[PDB]
Amino acid sequence: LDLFVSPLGRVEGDLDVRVTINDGVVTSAWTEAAMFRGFEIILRGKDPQAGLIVCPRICGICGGSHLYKSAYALDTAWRTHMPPNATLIRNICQACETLQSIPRYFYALFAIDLTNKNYAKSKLYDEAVRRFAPYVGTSYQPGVVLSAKPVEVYAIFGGQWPXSSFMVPGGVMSAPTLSDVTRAIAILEHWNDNWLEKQWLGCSVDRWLENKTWNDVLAWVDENESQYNSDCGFFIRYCLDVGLDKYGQGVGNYLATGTYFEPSLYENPTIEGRNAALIGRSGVFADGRYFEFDQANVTEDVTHSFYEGNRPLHPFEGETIPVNPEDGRRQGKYSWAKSPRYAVPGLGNVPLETGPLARRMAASAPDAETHQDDDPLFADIYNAIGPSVMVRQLARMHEGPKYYKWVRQWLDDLELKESFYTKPVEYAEGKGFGSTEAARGALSDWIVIEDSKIKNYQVVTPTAWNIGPRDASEVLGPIEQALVGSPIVDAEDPVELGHVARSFDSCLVCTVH
Amino acid sequence: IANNLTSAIGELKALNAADTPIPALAALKDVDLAGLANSLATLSGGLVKATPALNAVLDSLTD
Amino acid sequence: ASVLWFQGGACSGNTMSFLNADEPNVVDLIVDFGLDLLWHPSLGLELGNNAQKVFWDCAKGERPLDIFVFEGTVIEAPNGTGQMDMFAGRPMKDWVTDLAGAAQIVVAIGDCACFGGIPAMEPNPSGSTGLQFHKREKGGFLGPDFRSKMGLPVINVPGCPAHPDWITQILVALATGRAGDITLDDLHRPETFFKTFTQTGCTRVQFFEYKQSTLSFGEGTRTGCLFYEFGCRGPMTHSPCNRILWNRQSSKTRAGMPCLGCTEPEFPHFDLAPGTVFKTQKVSGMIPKEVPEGTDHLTYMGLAAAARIAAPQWSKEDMFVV
Amino acid sequence: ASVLWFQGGACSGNTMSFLNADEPNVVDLIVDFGLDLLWHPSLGLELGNNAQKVFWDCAKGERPLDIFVFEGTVIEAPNGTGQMDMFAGRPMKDWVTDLAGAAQIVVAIGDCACFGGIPAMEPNPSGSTGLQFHKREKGGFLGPDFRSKMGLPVINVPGCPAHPDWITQILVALATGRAGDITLDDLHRPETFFKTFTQTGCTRVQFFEYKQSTLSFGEGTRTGCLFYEFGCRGPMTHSPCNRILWNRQSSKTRAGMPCLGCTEPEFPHFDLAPGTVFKTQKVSGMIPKEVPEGTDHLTYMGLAAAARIAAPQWSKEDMFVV
Numbered sequence A: 001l002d003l004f005v006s007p008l009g010r011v012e013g014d015l016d017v018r019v020t021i022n023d024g025v026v027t028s029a030w031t032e033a034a035m036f037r038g039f040e041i042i043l044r045g046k047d048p049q050a051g052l053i054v055c056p057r058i059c060g061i062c063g064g065s066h067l068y069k070s071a072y073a074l075d076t077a078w079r080t081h082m083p084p085n086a087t088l089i090r091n092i093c094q095a096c097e098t099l100q101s102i103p104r105y106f107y108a109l110f111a112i113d114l115t116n117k118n119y120a121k122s123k124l125y126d127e128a129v130r131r132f133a134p135y136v137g138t139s140y141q142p143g144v145v146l147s148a149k150p151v152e153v154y155a156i157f158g159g160q161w162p163x164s165s166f167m168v169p170g171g172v173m174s175a176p177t178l179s180d181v182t183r184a185i186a187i188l189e190h191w192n193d194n195w196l197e198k199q200w201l202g203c204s205v206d207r208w209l210e211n212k213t214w215n216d217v218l219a220w221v222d223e224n225e226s227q228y229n230s231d232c233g234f235f236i237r238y239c240l241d242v243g244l245d246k247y248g249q250g251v252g253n254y255l256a257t258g259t260y261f262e263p264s265l266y267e268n269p270t271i272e273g274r275n276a277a278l279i280g281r282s283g284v285f286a287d288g289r290y291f292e293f294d295q296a297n298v299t300e301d302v303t304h305s306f307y308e309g310n311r312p313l314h315p316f317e318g319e320t321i322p323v324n325p326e327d328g329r330r331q332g333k334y335s336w337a338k339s340p341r342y343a344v345p346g347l348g349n350v351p352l353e354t355g356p357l358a359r360r361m362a363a364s365a366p367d368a369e370t371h372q373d374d375d376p377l378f379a380d381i382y383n384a385i386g387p388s389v390m391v392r393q394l395a396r397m398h399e400g401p402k403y404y405k406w407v408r409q410w411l412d413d414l415e416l417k418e419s420f421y422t423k424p425v426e427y428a429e430g431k432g433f434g435s436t437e438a439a440r441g442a443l444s445d446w447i448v449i450e451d452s453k454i455k456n457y458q459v460v461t462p463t464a465w466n467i468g469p470r471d472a473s474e475v476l477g478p479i480e481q482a483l484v485g486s487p488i489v490d491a492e493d494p495v496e497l498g499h500v501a502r503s504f505d506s507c508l509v510c511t512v513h
Numbered sequence B: 001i002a003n004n005l006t007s008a009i010g011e012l013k014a015l016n017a018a019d020t021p022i023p024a025l026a027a028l029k030d031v032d033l034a035g036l037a038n039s040l041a042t043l044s045g046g047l048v049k050a051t052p053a054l055n056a057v058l059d060s061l062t063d
Numbered sequence C, D: 001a002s003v004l005w006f007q008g009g010a011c012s013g014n015t016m017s018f019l020n021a022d023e024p025n026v027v028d029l030i031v032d033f034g035l036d037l038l039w040h041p042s043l044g045l046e047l048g049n050n051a052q053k054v055f056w057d058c059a060k061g062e063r064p065l066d067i068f069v070f071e072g073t074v075i076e077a078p079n080g081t082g083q084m085d086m087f088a089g090r091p092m093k094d095w096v097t098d099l100a101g102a103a104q105i106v107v108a109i110g111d112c113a114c115f116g117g118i119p120a121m122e123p124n125p126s127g128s129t130g131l132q133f134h135k136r137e138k139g140g141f142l143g144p145d146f147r148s149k150m151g152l153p154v155i156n157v158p159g160c161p162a163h164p165d166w167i168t169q170i171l172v173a174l175a176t177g178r179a180g181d182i183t184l185d186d187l188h189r190p191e192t193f194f195k196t197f198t199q200t201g202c203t204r205v206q207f208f209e210y211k212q213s214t215l216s217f218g219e220g221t222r223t224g225c226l227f228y229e230f231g232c233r234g235p236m237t238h239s240p241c242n243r244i245l246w247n248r249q250s251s252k253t254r255a256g257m258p259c260l261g262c263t264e265p266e267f268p269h270f271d272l273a274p275g276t277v278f279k280t281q282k283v284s285g286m287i288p289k290e291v292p293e294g295t296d297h298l299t300y301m302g303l304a305a306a307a308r309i310a311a312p313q314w315s316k317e318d319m320f321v322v
């Protein structure tokens, strides 16, 4: 059965999903990013800092991430100096945007599908409906409402959220005051207490972060009624009951570009020094092995994308030349998403899943420096039960406590008397690579400044990694392979396709830009 | 207020705009400027009408 | 009051900003104010054919459509087909045509929808335009003479993104019987928000008054106004950004970021051409090319010189201190 | 960090304002920030001898007293006995002596406690004074040389009442290890709040810049600045009232009420003498007696004439429209 689902909403943009279904199981999948704005085209010839204004507009929910990586692209291109306070503010704001994204996405975009009638036979279904029904769910309302708090912190430092451009080469535009920091701390603590710990965890962030194995997580669920009946405990139990742990596996290979620089280690941003300075470590996890991320290994294939091109292009030489979707469909192209691939030795140019799960796998890599995220939890989960909708979601949710703790510490780390900005030299020429981990994963800018203008500007977003179509080798993108194997109880409401696509927290406006 | 006038003049001093030093324009009284104007006035209606012939001469000098 | 919120060439920033709503928050707006959110691409439960059923019922008049909110640009490329924005089996522009023709009120939220915004920046690959404007030029996709069924033009809630209150308070006004209190300016923006300037309530207006310039970002923004060195469009931009603070916390200008004039239809101004980003274009290095709204370069500059000479000492020192 | 909050000649408005705290709210401040509120007359559970036991343990050093917050004036009448303020078996001033001598930090919240405030208005029947100030004159009840055990003078959080953030953010700073970030001005006010003026962020500064006066209350405040006709002390008053809005909504000046300069030690200014309430005292009917801080009448008036000449049309029209 060929099933074309249009729209598949709650993916922050325009997504259609075509699936071949045999015996109630998806056997092949095509993700079709359906809306194109062409910001890379627009940025060409613009002011070298135009990215700081344009790139946040790639996406509303993760524009702060775009800003972060665009700023760092300029910082590397212009060989700027980043005062530690500026690095801290950038980290805080990136993480706060992610902390907003986590509940906002979970309740508003993902968890309402847990109320699908396909689960009516579950013993937890009534509770799932009570908690996660759209707009009236007892977990939905506070989760969504409180999701605005972390971006209040963002606004304290950046003026507003979404749509500040306050991260600039050489630091940040803002000069936090004491009350700024104290209020940011108060907002963060209130959000942590009222949503993260009270509602999501039913325990302290510290208690959750003590979970180092999948068995630890199950014991945590059963440990007491607070954790058992928390949104996290209920979600885990619901997933195990309704089978969200049984599909959406995907590629099983992961890309994290990392983000959150240790301020002392990235005072002078360079492409080469980026990985060592990361707190949230970069890392590629492919074929069960850890690899260092290298942006040089990133290509974008447009074979099945609505763009002209005949070979994968490293984004420094990237091109965004749209083809008319009618013509492209005549050529087998089906998506405005490019197909980002990563050259892994011994594997070729493979698709890599990006996102919190990719980050957790990267955090499980050996040889973490002291400043770096060293977390074996999702290595253990991956080895124990493997990837799935549930495990992907749990990675996302696991970042909540971890990032909250990091943000709280960074707010403590701010040295308010110290500089927030080193005026850079706006060089007429430069090649910049800025990367971050937006909520949904590796977000990267490759910028080429020439003649004091943007010569090239290539954005590769995490959902482009995940949802990008088949490459020249017809290798399905991570979301496409995750869709394959998904059960389809009801083709009229193929909610499992939504579960898989949304478990990646897909953002289609980011996918295409 | 003196510091305000100092910062204002100090911004005037950093003018950074076009500037040309040309000092000689002598021998204008000796020129019969009025007389040439009289020649030009009787000739202006001839010159304006002769523009196509003057251009056709100039075009042959551009080679 | 049924609400159908569609996204064209959008980044969903207006939706995310909207989700930041407080007093009312978004959930209370959707539930407790009688605003039946039929669907929203970021929030609607329905997918696929069920969602399309909702859309088609709205478009054909099978069910009433009181408010059609459109976010993002109306994408017309390629070649006016709109296929760079395919939504629910149609070019999004066709949905826009049908639903704008069906709605009692049409609200364009965000510059993209109002005026074309960032996607309409040259070279405008998506053929983006606003609902009733292309930049300042009235008409956009729906034509200058488009009126919704309540007789209103497209209500333009500009911004990039719009502040949540700019839409939520309008929605509350509509829901509380105060639609008649809503007056629109020449850009169809609610005058309750867009008679003020961004500068109105800016923490740096005293520095502006005394022509004391912020000289640098970061700690340099502990003093000064951003108009002179950072291209702040505050005094040329209608908005309540400093009256109604963003995220209930701040505003770009308060934080030290120049207002980019995003509520204005030309946004991004000068199409972010080289030398125009976070810079004040000046004539002869001293005179801003653009002076505040309603002023003239000669009286502005004369008053600016007078203000500089009479400047108090505190206007020349840090004020947003730790 | 133990906190003992006492009220002398107070109206409890600082407490009520404090209870309006958001980010942190008062409950989260008291519980989740490690600030052990030992007692507060409006909130403490203990009464009678149990409360007195708490007070005496703090006064005699039996239990540590980290922050002594004092609200209200130190009442010394009659005849320096302080018996117009009898609290828990003693004149309140005696409690003040003991607890201020015991506390690590002493915070006077509100003008009454900081400077004497309204009760210290002539004829001052209660013999009211501030902790370390009587109006602008340093010394108040505790003397100019009083220092708490952490070496600080009385931290004056002025206002009538103080805005909740003016105290809560200080308390958070103390609780989060940022006490060293707190700098105090010459009136012992936190400079993080009191380097700005009330005017800083006022929605009417553009009208001020162009010398456009609000002419009347009510709808008359849809335009204009209140300085010229309503005695707005905004430009002479240090406060973040327009930076950090009151109740997260507004400020007097935004709302159309003149700033009464309540964060200033002279408040109420001119002791509310006849003709000084909601009026600008003027010389020759056109020159304000008091000009903005750091300006002189000559320059101020010259710039004012220039601004009146340069004033754009919008500055002469309603801007805070319905």
Ligand code: FCO
Pocket: A059, A061, A062, A065, A066, A438, A439, A440, A441, A442, A443, A444, A461, A462, A463, A464, A506, A507, A510, A511
């Ligand atoms: N998070 C996020 Fe948006 C996506 N995909 C970017 O980057």
Ligand code: F3S
Pocket: A057, A060, A163, C009, C010, C011, C012, C013, C014, C071, C072, C073, C109, C110, C111, C112, C113, C117, C118, C159, C160, C161, C162
């Ligand atoms: S917020 Fe986004 S939808 Fe358009 S108005 Fe700005 S690019």
Ligand code: F3S
Pocket: C198, C199, C200, C202, C203, C204, C205, C206, C208, C224, C225, C226, C227, C232, C233, C234, C235, C253, C258, C259
């Ligand atoms: S007063 Fe404010 S709005 Fe801009 S022009 Fe100056 S920073």
Ligand code: F3S
Pocket: C159, C160, C198, C237, C238, C239, C241, C251, C252, C253, C258, C259, C260, C261, C262, C263
């Ligand atoms: S850029 Fe826009 S959000 Fe306000 S501060 Fe300026 S009008």
Ligand code: F3S
Pocket: D009, D010, D011, D012, D013, D014, D071, D072, D073, D109, D110, D111, D112, D113, D117, D118, D159, D160, D161, D162
């Ligand atoms: S609020 Fe009340 S306690 Fe004193 S400072 Fe004002 S009269």
Ligand code: F3S
Pocket: D198, D199, D200, D202, D203, D204, D205, D206, D208, D224, D225, D226, D227, D232, D233, D234, D235, D253, D258, D259
């Ligand atoms: S600018 Fe505002 S603070 Fe008072 S003096 Fe005018 S109303």
Ligand code: F3S
Pocket: D159, D160, D198, D237, D238, D239, D241, D251, D252, D253, D258, D259, D260, D261, D262, D263
């Ligand atoms: S009276 Fe006081 S509360 Fe603020 S507006 Fe003036 S300083």
Ligand SMILES: [Mg+2]
Pocket: A040, A338, A458, A459, A460, A461, A512, A513
């Ligand atoms: Mg790209």
Ligand code: 3NI
Pocket: A012, A058, A059, A060, A061, A062, A063, A507, A508, A509, A510
């Ligand atoms: Ni996104």
